Design a protein around this ligand. Structure first.
Ligand code: 8C1
Length: 270
């Protein structure tokens, strides 16, 4: 990891121009704020935010995998804390599912590669005894070849008083304070429902507001929910991915499959 001085990161991000890229600024998104930078011949991602910063570096130093984002460097010039990453041209899975900024809809073929890639990333994390604690489509980034790269390891862990994560993706025991890798499985089940439907996990102007509630709705079909912005989706593979998501979303943590089974099932699907 390269140690950058804050001034270097100031200059490459147009003094952290917080305006969105579309408006002429450098902001890519927020969780801290993510800025586009240009360091020499390289386009980079600069996250300007301490325990979460030290944890992000700690996890990245140990975890290097093609389905995890790569940390290039950092900056800790007192007050301001920055994390520098390899640039992901196709942004997040959330934005590609919503076709934000007019990007074309992802094909079913591509969606299957993304789901498999994301499962391989979680498997590496779990094999290396790490619980992500914030698995969501906004944290699944896409490179130039649409290779799934898991991001945001600031809250990662090797019961708690401080409950953290994204409510719409969280398992019941996670909402209660339990720290378990079985909780990441549940959240991935929500991500698989987003991949199938193209619907966000939460929508205030929707019935049901929460995507995970459609599983109970179907248990009373998935064909009605399949993303219509695809022409290469076959019922056999869609139902097979839904079966994986359904198993992931079992409300009883011990009845959910481990990431290795999830990988195996996603492999058997294609
Ligand atoms: C590792 C991380 C800093 O990298 C990125 C984050 C991105 C993003 O972040 C949102 C806020 C943080 C939570 N995720 C959503 C949205 C859209 N595109 C993003 C591209 C990158 C990248 N490295 O090119």
């Amino acid at each position: 990891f390269h140690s950058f001085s804050f001034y270097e990161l100031k200059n490459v991000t147009n003094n952290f121009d917080e305006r969105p890229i579309s408006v002429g600024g450098n902001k890519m998104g927020e969780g801290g704020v993510v800025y586009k930078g240009y360091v020499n011949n390289t386009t980079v991602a600069v996250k300007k935010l301490k325990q979460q910063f030290d944890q992000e570096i700690k996890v990245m130093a140990k975890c290097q995998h093609e389905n995890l984002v790569e940390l290039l460097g950092f900056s800790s010039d007192g007050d301001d804390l920055c994390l520098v990453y390899v640039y992901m041209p196709n942004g997040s899975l959330l934005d590609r599912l919503s076709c934000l900024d007019g990007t074309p809809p992802l094909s079913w073929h591509m969606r299957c590669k993304i789901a498999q890639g994301a499962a391989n990333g979680i498997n590496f994390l779990h094999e290396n005894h790490h619980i992500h604690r914030d698995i969501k489509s906004a944290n699944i980034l896409l490179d130039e070849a649409f290779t799934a790269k898991i991001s945001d390891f600031g809250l990662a862990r090797a019961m708690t008083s401080r409950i953290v994560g994204t409510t719409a993706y969280m398992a019941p025991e996670a909402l209660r304070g339990e720290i378990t890798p079985k909780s990441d499985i549940y959240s991935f089940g929500v991500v698989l429902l987003e991949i199938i439907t193209g619907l966000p996990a939460v929508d205030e102007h929707r019935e049901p507001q929460l995507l995970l509630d459609i599983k109970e709705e179907i248990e009373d079909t998935i064909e009605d929910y399949i993303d219509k912005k695809m022409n290469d989706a076959d019922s056999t593979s869609v139902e097979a991915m839904y079966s994986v998501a359904s198993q992931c979303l079992h409300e009883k943590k011990n009845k959910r499959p481990d990431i290795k089974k999830v990988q195996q099932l996603l492999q058997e699907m294609t």
